[PDB]
Subunit: 726 residues, 4 copies
């Protein structure tokens, strides 16, 4: 029951493109990729080769195929301790999933700053460009359970644990620069409204349902982040191709005690890219693990996710200089007003070994800050600081969750706390309190200072009465949604209108639809009319006369809010489907593969069955997947080489492959006799921008396809796809 | 008062076809449908209309929109016990999902025998055709988590809790008449092989991956239930149009002490029906809650699932 | 700088006698002591000196005396993550105590066999006299909670974890050779009857209440272990001076497959010794931690607890050769019929570092056996096999309790079990199932064999119907109690009578006392009449005429069942109280102390205040404790040297000290004018056996005292004590 | 949360209020109350916003904190008055 004699059960421990080898635990795939945190986990990594199978008590098992019984057709005996231990462990494998962001995918990596930031912060991890800090990053969706789909429409989480020399800092962010609500007291209300409804627990992974849109229509502070969710920001192509934001204003504190306000940004060095809705929603059915798989495979291929940490910095004296409150998490700080200053680079370069032990059990919490950072009075952040330590008591089984290996600091930690469930650390200190004389008061407090000092909070002045009251400066809800809307390209605006139209069409109670369209009319009448038209609603004269909200500090637009207005494409790590036939023209395939290789773009060779096909020169081509098995949804572009095109010309799946890719605005390239497929997608003889065609694949043909890929999708084709039956 | 003045927020408490009205909790949609178990749950049913919002300690809340802070732009105070109770409760809402059959959809109902079976069993619930036993039934898939999709290819669970006069009897079955393995000692091996692979936790809801088929290839006892999963039995149209089976031979024991071997079956009175694969897989994207929805909406329409 | 300048805060890291230095964590007190399990725990031991105080996330704390507030008299802020982490950990410190045996005290040590037992067992740990196996042993009571007193009347547990090269073997025994009930299905009923009654949760640590005696009176199978409990076996002097037993018949399996029935024994090398009831009960008030303290201090002094493992062996073909069933755990195997064969020695030589992490979290379970052992069908053992795995799921938080450091095997353990709460091990195996090909089926099953083989159960024949039925062979309840009773000395019998009389006087419902007396009449009339007389119950003519049960295989007694019938005293590690005065005769003190030192007997110097006193010749004598502060209960003998006796002659506490020690049968020695204390204990001028007296404290005065100590108590004194008001 | 097993410790009979209690809190380990409210959030329209907030007042009013004035800097410091 054993491995094949040729060793093909085991993936090469070298970088390989997606699909070339089975995926594997990180430490077996990239044994030479190390960092201080990865090394520190060696105490708990367990191998397997050459070891006997045992009980958890170390007793060798002789027969792991049978229960102990009285005769071979008899009853199972209660003294079978080997069966009972194995089945008890199984029966208790599950722990509670995270209340929100339960679906997530994680990896290890490292960060380093470009230059010392000691003038603005005393944080040790930002102090030296050559001091590297290991990180562990989890990306997530928000609403759905741990078993829900990846390419839903949702906000995405982007949480980074930095294992610094002065403590763990967790930067627990999302992929949009604001949140839906202003004060943490409403968090359970908002979450309950977006989550599956309580009677029947439907719908999973979707805000397209009555209670969410009821809450939005009654709480206009949500509209800004709803605009982001309804745009293509809600459906990223990959966690490598989205932005990250800390949302809140925090403080940096330097060694002289000066505070600067800061908001944190991650910029994806692979560029910004998102799916289109029909593609995203179909991909939730064809590969619900699409983002998890793409992240793992990019890392196995060497296409490591890279992101640039950036800070927007506002001096303390400029707190009130904007037309919005800096402490309001439903407001963004436009980059035209305050630029993002580049701070450092993070590279994710190794996958975990075991998803449960590393990803499921990791705990991130934004209250895990270090000296040189501090909080502000943002009322959403303030409440988050309560929740993330509280929730681990049930999720991770008690107060020792920091001794779960992935969560452990790699710097020293010593204190007088003791006991609690599954306590690992055995304290030898004769004292468990301070002040003590019996251990000469160790471990000891440390004064604050420029480096290696104790934490002290910035001594912000507090003046007010004890109130449960929203600041009046937070009571403006329409100007930021409007700025976002005006900053999108025309096709991005069309997709926003489509996202609201789709969602509100699934709200069963029509008055809720009407109320949301009335909110939209307070943002932009063109948006509101376009959504109302799709819903069969007519705006009233009063609604047509609503005065637009003001510009944000004079801005009519900020192009940094668009995914696509400023080119930033990077094709390395993208994937193309190559539709084979049973006699491929090998000179076309040579040229295609050579050009793709030079840009780091991967290929998947598809056919109408699995196994191999032979090219015209005898080259044996292994088939990665069938046309139906790996649909166009899973790739960025489609190329069809010449050869025996009659083999595939009338194959329904191959023709549909091209029609789906066309509808979803992907570049298509057709060589030689593959040009007969132009007829399936109605391309004119003269050609169309976005369809590359020629007698053969060559240098010019591939350069054109690759230029298309750098622009991600063929937006000009949009008016031509409504007629296509696909 | 946020409800529309026309009363359109509230579904009619009468049978209505799918999509005609918003769905509702069963006791609000069908208040006059009763059985002995549903009546016994009255002690714990909590309403809401006309009551004041309170903490869990019964203290009325005045402002459920704001944390307590020192100044309206100031820091939140630790003495805000109303915020901390609400968020504590929220923070501990989740419990572990079931190790298998975590994705399932349930409903209440009742069972009645056609005739007394006292000649073959002394079970009280099968003793008298006029004796009604309340039931609660959960249908499920096997591999995926509680937030996975309904129309995956998988075996389905079909579990029935009979609330009898002589104790709870749970008939915990599936939709095929056999299982993949012979001895319980192998259940964690089989389940680990069909569940998402342990390095990366992929794939959800699918046996279409190397470790499942590795196990199958090495344990030919699995081939019979794999045949059923690969057939259209693995993609039912609805929980109403699949069969149920207890799988195992059990015994019936009569009052004279005679044992008879028995295997349990459920026949769907709606008939048997399945999807085709491309449709099932696509539907897991277009509506991952399709079976849970269809069950709930068939009951709200009066198309009650019936099984013999 | 809080430690005193002279270093007197820190205990000497060397062996010191009880009271000489404060006690300390074991790795600080005895850094040189080691074994393979103590070495394997080093990876989780945490130090303290010279480290900064931090959060659990490694952030250094500047001020650990204050919460963060708005103004120094203002409200505490929610953003104080340092205060909330420290209070959260504190708030979750406690875990469920064990359902039974909650009160217990533990130590590390080692075991070695005297010779290889390969002819009868293939167990690795017994295969080589040079093979040393680390152990961890916890001693306990049964009924009380974790915070109940040590010197209650109760059965004691004696549980040993052997960390062998082939797995953890736990020998989970008690200090009597039988248990109270026959079938595990009754365990919850019996334990609920002995436990505090459910309305008011009284009494703690006591069987002297109506429900316990109700159950006993209705369940005569309990009477054997109840006889042991009522005897002085119920009140051991120390865990060092009690026997241990596995109770059940198990099997040994050799390399040829031959099974031998075995019962396990621990023999205390310090000998057998118990308190008397008034002393035990009073000590629960004056020092409820007396046995935990004695164990810890013995190990700090080098008076290591030592036990000899022994086996009673019966060949398979002798299964039915006795008048009682080998599988009945309410029957003992008399040593007159089946001798105990010495097997090896265990020495406990290191205390834990942290009581919660090592003692509270240790899990012992009798199902934890290794190749070379197996179970039998004893129906009490059979049920135990279920409970000990199950109960850990709530007590220790889940199925990973073997990864808590104290529980971890020191031998390899590898299997396909995964996840669960608190998962520490990070599995790198590509497979989590077997059979697999993708990891070449590792880790792999191992066939049984003579060494290092897989576990296989002995193929015992089973034949019968499925029944809920007690074997008729278990239905005999009185013969083993009568053997025990007849094996006791006359003074032991008196203390048994007094144990039942005291307990039954606390039973409020008189009929239950009557029903218990009726059971005693089926055991021995003399016993029953003597209890009855103390309860004001008169036996009926029918009770006077019950035929005594038969002898057991011809035995009318077995002296191995008595604590005292066969002298086995050792004075090493006992303690004497020396009562000082303000002008002690130094020649007396020098001779006493020299003699006690030579035999390894400790002393405590007592007076009426703390500080020091000065001897007649200028020597300064440090006082350990006051008369009231270290009462006679806590010592084994009392010596009063000469000097200024008038200083203490009319000190009530000093007088009371000697009356208490006299009542409790302890040797008392009086030198010179200290003989004036003869009047307080009503001793005649010619003296009496058990009171040592002379003009000075040598020639033979200390030899006389030491011979009295080797015999433990002065049993001949018992007639005289009733006339002492103490 | 650890001692009594989760956040529904108020449903343990001795801890239950004798007066009404209704809110939008749901689930948690060993949840006894079966809520029938169509809504588990507020503000909601689908249950006309019930159960509803109550302004503070002389009797049967909602809880409001006394509006004590707070003036100071954020500090970890013992008042000198306590020394
Ligand atoms: C700016 C607004 C917020 C952002 C950007 C945010 C971000 C996130 C992210 C990314 C995660 C997933 C981390 C992971 O991968 O494990 C998470 C989890 C969580 N958040 Fe937030 N969050 C926000 C607001 C809140 C609020 C207002 C609360 C409640 C007071 C809250 C409580 C929680 C809890 C209980 C978890 C699960 C934590 C765990 O079990 O480890 N969050 N949040
Ligand atoms: C005849 C083969 C089997 C059938 C028909 C079957 C059926 C089911 C069903 C339908 C459920 C879901 C119950 C629900 O809806 O709540 C379930 C749950 C479960 N089963 Fe099985 N099962 C089989 C084999 C096994 C085996 C071999 C084991 C382990 C020894 C096992 C252990 C479990 C466990 C731990 C659960 C979760 C139950 C809970 O959390 O309450 N099952 N089973
Ligand atoms: C000969 C009869 C028995 C003997 C000699 C015995 C011995 C012991 C001892 C010495 C302990 C304390 C172990 C420690 O220090 O952690 C213990 C604990 C325990 N025993 Fe027994 N026992 C007996 C019968 C039973 C039975 C019949 C059951 C139930 C079927 C049971 C269930 C337990 C449980 C639940 C614990 C606490 C274990 C833990 O929490 O880890 N025992 N037993």
């Amino acid at each position: 029951s054993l491995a094949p004699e040729d060793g093909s059960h085991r993936p090469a421990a070298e970088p390989t493109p997606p699909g070339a080898q089975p995926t594997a635990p990180g430490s077996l795939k990239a044994p030479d990729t190390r960092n201080e945190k990865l090394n520190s986990l060696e105490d708990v990594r367990k191998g397997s080769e050459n070891y006997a199978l045992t009980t958890n008590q170390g007793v060798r098992i002789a027969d792991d195929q049978n229960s102990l019984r009285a005769g071979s057709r008899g009853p199972t005996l209660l003294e079978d301790f080997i069966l009972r231990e194995k089945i008890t462990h199984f029966d208790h494998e599950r722990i509670p999933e995270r209340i929100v962001h339960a679906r997530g995918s994680a990896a290890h990596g490292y960060f380093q700053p470009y230059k010392s930031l000691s003038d603005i912060t005393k944080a040790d991890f930002l102090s030296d460009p050559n001091k590297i800090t290991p990180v562990f990053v989890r990306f997530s969706t928000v609403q759905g359970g741990a078993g829900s789909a990846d390419t839903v429409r949702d906000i995405r989480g982007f949480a980074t644990k930095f294992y610094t020399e002065e403590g763990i800092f967790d930067l627990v962010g999302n992929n949009t620069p604001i949140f839906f609500i202003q004060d943490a007291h409403k968090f359970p209300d908002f979450v309950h409204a977006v989550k599956p409804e309580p009677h029947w627990a439907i719908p999973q992974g979707q805000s397209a349902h009555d209670t969410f849109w009821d809450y939005v229509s009654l709480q206009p502070e949500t509209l800004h982040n709803v605009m982001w969710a309804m745009s293509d920001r809600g459906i990223p192509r990959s966690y490598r191709t989205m932005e990250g934001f800390g949302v809140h204003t925090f403080r940096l504190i330097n060694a002289e005690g000066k505070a600067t306000f800061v908001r944190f940004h991650w910029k994806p060095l692979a560029g910004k890219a998102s799916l289109v809705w029909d593609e995203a929603q179909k991909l939730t059915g064809r590969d619900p693990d699409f983002h998890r798989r793409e992240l793992w495979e990019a890392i196995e291929a060497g296409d490591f996710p890279e992101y640039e940490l950036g800070f927007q910095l506002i001096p303390e004296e400029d707190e009130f200089k904007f037309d919005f409150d800096l402490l309001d998490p439903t407001k963004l700080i436009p980059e035209e007003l305050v630029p993002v200053q580049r701070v450092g680079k993070m590279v994710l370069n190794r996958n975990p070994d075991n998803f449960f032990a590393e990803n499921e059990q990791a705990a991130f919490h934004p209250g895990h800050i270090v000296p040189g950072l501090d909080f502000t009075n943002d009322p959403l952040l303030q409440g988050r600081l309560f929740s993330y330590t509280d929730t681990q008591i049930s999720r991770l089984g008690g107060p020792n969750f920091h001794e779960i290996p992935i969560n452990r600091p790699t710097c020293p930690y010593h204190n007088f706390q003791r006991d609690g469930m599954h306590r690992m650390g055995i304290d030898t200190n004769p004292a468990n309190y301070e002040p003590n004389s019996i251990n000469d008061n160790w471990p000891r407090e440390t004064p604050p200072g420029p480096k290696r000092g104790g934490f002290e909070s910035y001594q912000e002045r507090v003046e007010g009465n004890k109130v449960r009251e929203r600041s009046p400066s937070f009571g403006e809800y329409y100007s930021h949604p409007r700025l976002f809307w005006l900053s999108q390209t025309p096709f991005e605006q069309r997709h926003i209108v489509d996202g609201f139209s789709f969602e509100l069409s699934k709200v069963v109670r029509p008055y809720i639809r009407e109320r949301v369209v009335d909110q939209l009319a307070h943002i932009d009448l063109t948006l509101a009319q376009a959504v109302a038209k799709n819903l069969g609603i007519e705006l009233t004269d009063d609604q047509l006369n609503i005065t637009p909200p003001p510009d944000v500090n004079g801005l009519k637009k900020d192009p940094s809010l668009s995914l696509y207005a400023i080119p930033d494409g990077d094709v390395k790590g993208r994937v193309v489907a190559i539709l084979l036939n049973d006699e491929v023209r090998s000179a076309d395939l040579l040229a295609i593969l050579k050009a793709l290789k030079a840009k780091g773009v991967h290929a998947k060779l598809l056919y109408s069955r699995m196994g191999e096909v032979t090219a015209d020169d005898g080259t044996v081509l292994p088939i990665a997947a069938t046309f139906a098995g790996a649909p166009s949804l899973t790739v960025d572009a489609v190329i069809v080489p010449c050869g025996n095109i009659a083999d595939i010309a009338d194959n329904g799946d191959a023709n549909y492959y091209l029609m789906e890719a066309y509808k979803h605005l992907k570049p298509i390239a057709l060589a030689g006799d593959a040009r007969k497929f132009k007829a399936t997608i109605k391309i004119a003889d003269q050609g169309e921008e976005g369809i590359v065609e020629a007698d053969s694949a060559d240098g010019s043909f591939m350069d054109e396809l690759l230029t298309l890929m750098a622009a991600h999708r063929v937006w000009s084709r949009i008016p031509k796809i409504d007629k296509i039956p696909a």
